[PDB]
Amino acid sequence: GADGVGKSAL
Amino acid sequence: IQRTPKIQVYSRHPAENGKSNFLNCYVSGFHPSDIEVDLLKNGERIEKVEHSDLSFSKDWSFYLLYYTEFTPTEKDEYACRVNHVTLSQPKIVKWDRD
């Protein structure tokens, strides 16, 4: 299952 | 900044004439991801060719497997044709049973 919490914005 | 594909052309199972098999073209170690891969029977493009999902290795270079069901014979020639920005001209690798 993928890493879905948050938003990994560069 | 770009990396040229390595190309291997081979069968899924050891080739035996008259026995159904899969013809594979594995392209690996390339960057960027855009790439054109065709499987050829006696120089003509094989329709119905499936491929794996784009993935990459620890070194960030991409790899793909293109494959088609085939029945090898004594005389039929098979090949893989690959084009990528790092190549001057499309590269043709013949299938060699060995």
Binding site: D3, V5, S8, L10 | -
Partner: protein, 273 residues
Amino acid sequence: SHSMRYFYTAVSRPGRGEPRFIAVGYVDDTQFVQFDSDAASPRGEPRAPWVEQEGPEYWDRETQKYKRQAQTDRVNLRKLRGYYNQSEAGSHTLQRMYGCDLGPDGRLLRGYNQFAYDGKDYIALNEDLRSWTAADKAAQITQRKWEAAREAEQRRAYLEGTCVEWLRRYLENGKKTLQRAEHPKTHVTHHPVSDHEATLRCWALGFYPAEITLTWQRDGEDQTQDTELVETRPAGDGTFQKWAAVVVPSGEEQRYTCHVQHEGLPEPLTLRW
């Protein structure tokens, strides 16, 4: 040891279409999921039977994760082009790989979460799962932003907790094949080059997992600089193939031995022509 690994690729395509986002997930050397934003109606898709029987809530939630990530990476591609002052005409690639490694005792050995831009390291989460390593000046912008946002704490919670929980679930549900070793089927072939030399090729076929060592020896001495090794390649049925070759002088074939080491072999194998 066992691992769960995710691979994301985001590609900008000016003039041809919207950016592509494609994700694939693996347990060890076995793929179980794909998402491709180029598909007609993009959804998370099973690639292994042990995830095919997950319920609709599982697949709906994975699909929504991927849809969110595809939108985030469309924004990320634009952000990076600005950081580097690159032309809008060029196509660029953002890759992310993350996952969790269990050690041979079954406990978490290592979590990772790293990024590359145009094939070059950009930023990575350090092994402490608390700090970052930035590869260049643009990535130091991202590092400051992620330190401010406490991004590493979110990623640590996934890599140490959620990730391991998924991996253990899949190892149990897919036990019949993920916990298998398939030993290599091995043989030697012989190919005259001329009247004075021939290549000996040592084959390993049908093995799982992909890790393997093939070596040629000559009177018990490794032929390191003389051996041609092809990259390990997928058979297409979940198993792998490899070969190693040496060119030997005509009439000296009997001095050469091939050696195969693999998890599925009780003892390393020795082959002779």
